[PDB]
């Protein structure tokens, strides 16, 4: 099993804006308690699930746990890359699996809810906190 994506970087700055705060407190909150949230709350354990070719095909793995801990530690710079992480999770599920599979339908429902919630995003980004690299 490959290591999970980093959630903190000493060479990267730490930023918190109103949109990232919203993504953590509303979007990630409401997608975490969704009924179809469990297959995307952990990194894909390709060893354990008989999926040896998974990381040949998913070159950027992503899960709601990694995104959650990235938002908690203020690892992101702005909201766009957190939204990109969510979209990468959904697209990883899509590319890896088949359009009629149950997990693809679950990811599609999650993505629809996510797109609604991010449509409810604050339009103007306001910086709350910034810390330079250590």
């Amino acid at each position: 099993n490959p290591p999970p994506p980093e959630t903190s970087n000493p060479n990267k700055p730490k930023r918190q804006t109103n949109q990232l705060q919203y993504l953590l407190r509303v979007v990630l909150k409401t997608l975490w308690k969704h009924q179809f949230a469990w297959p995307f709350q952990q990194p894909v354990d390709a060893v354990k699930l008989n999926l040896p070719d998974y990381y040949k095909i998913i070159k950027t793995p992503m899960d709601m746990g990694t995104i959650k801990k990235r938002l908690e530690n203020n690892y992101y710079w702005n909201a766009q890359e957190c939204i990109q992480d969510f979209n990468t999770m959904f697209t990883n599920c899509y590319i890896y699996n088949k359009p009629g599979d149950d997990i693809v339908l679950m990811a599609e429902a999650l993505e629809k809810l996510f797109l609604q919630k991010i449509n409810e995003l604050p339009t103007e980004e306001t910086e709350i906190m910034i810390v330079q690299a250590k």
Binding site: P39, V44, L49, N50, L51, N97, D101, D102, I103, M106
Partner: peptide, 12 residues
């Protein structure tokens, strides 16, 4: 573990 095959099902 029974509650594991449920994981292995929705990721054929």
């Amino acid at each position: 573990k029974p509650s594991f095959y449920v994981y292995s099902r929705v990721k054929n």
